[PDB]
Ligand code: HEM
């Protein structure tokens with residue numbers, strides 16, 4: 001069993017071995033199970049074949065009890081999964097992406113009034129609070145100013161736990177029942193009409209969603225699925241910090257952004273998502289015996305798809321370990337070569353329905369940093385680990401001398 005080695009190597013565990021064995025797949029004992037680990041765009045296509053792969057019983061209990069919730073969308077298959085996935089997709093269309101991006105812009109502009117007076121700020125901490133306030137407001141979830149930071153911390157504790165052991169994992173295990181109880185009473189109040197809800201917002205649509213047989217979700221399950229909207233919006237915090245890091249470490253792109261418009265901002269944001277680590281891999285179970293790439297996949301075998309390694313595959317990407325947003329000028333759009341938030345079709349599998357929200361929030365936040373304020377980046381540890389999952393520049397990205405531009 002290689003699980004401790006996986007903990008040691010993190011994002012590079014699969015890529016180190018696919019390179020060493022000169023193969024796009026290898027066998028390994030991980031998580032107590034027999035696994036095949038695979039990488040590359042062709043492997044991602046096979047992974048998203050839902051006749052060959054299922055997610056039920058692929059999600060380790062420890063992941064359900066920390067980041068995702070028990071028996072939630074991530075572990076569902078078949079028409080029941082697709083049914084629930086349409087609920088998430090309806091909440092993440094461009095009107096929602098635009099609304100969230102606009103709320104973020106308003107928050108960043110409002111933040112300058114305090115940042116200019118305090119001089120020094122930790123971007124990760126500011127982002128967490130703003131995103132939590134914006135996510136709850138857009139969703140219709142009441143949120144008191146005195147609890148913004150606690151709820152944001154609970155959301156991040158769940159994200160930060162998914163690849164951890166020891167105290168960091170325990171933080172996520174403790175935060176999940178707090179968040180679920182908090183949101184569940186909201187669901188219950190909404191269903192009794194004791195909390196005002198609005199058609200087309202996340203609280204309303206999760207509270208009143210009906211399944212294929214016409215029954216509502218259990219209030220706890222509706223709460224879990226609403227957290228599966230609120231938590232990943234706060235998780236955009238990680239990408240916002242990596243975006244600011246890339247700006248600092250590749251300063252030639254700042255004037256490139258200042259001169260240009262949303263096209264350059266979008267190429268920059270896509271390169272942040274491709275280049276920096278966030279989700280290392282995905283798990284599934286072989287649904288039926290099949291053969292691919294001269295390997296027999298036996299029913300019941302667990303499988304890991306390498307997100308990070310595919311995103312740095314030199315067969316797909318020129319100089320894959322350099323940050324070069326211009327690579328997305330005149331590049332073909334494809335569902336399997338660029339998979340930091342999954343691959344394939346979100347309507348037909350488990351691909352992230354939040355990609356558009358992620359991208360527009362990142363673009364709005366990049367615009368703020370480039371056009372709205374000036375700032376310095378003082379001496380600090382900007383190192384981010386490829387072993388620690390998820391990963392973040394250690395300091396959280398400290399900014400100082402902040403001035404209204
Ligand atoms: C912040 C950066 C984000 C990253 C790195 C990310 C990444 C991912 C990945 C890798 C998956 C699983 C894909 C698969 O299993 O095939 C996923 C699923 C999901 N994401 Fe995201 N995501 C992010 C943001 C968001 C946002 C902002 C939302 C909602 C507003 C969201 C909602 C979801 C949901 C509901 C699923 C489960 C979909 C399903 O099982 O069918 N995510 N995400």
Ligand SMILES: CCCCCC/C=C\CCCCCCCC(=O)O
Pocket residue numbers: 058059060063067159162231232235279281282283284
């Ligand atoms: C058997 C190994 C399973 C894979 C372990 C990690 C699983 C999924 C990674 C997270 C997917 C969604 C992340 C978006 C952010 C969030 O939901 O908080």
Ligand SMILES: [Mg+2]
Pocket residue numbers: 209210211212
């Ligand atoms: Mg229904």
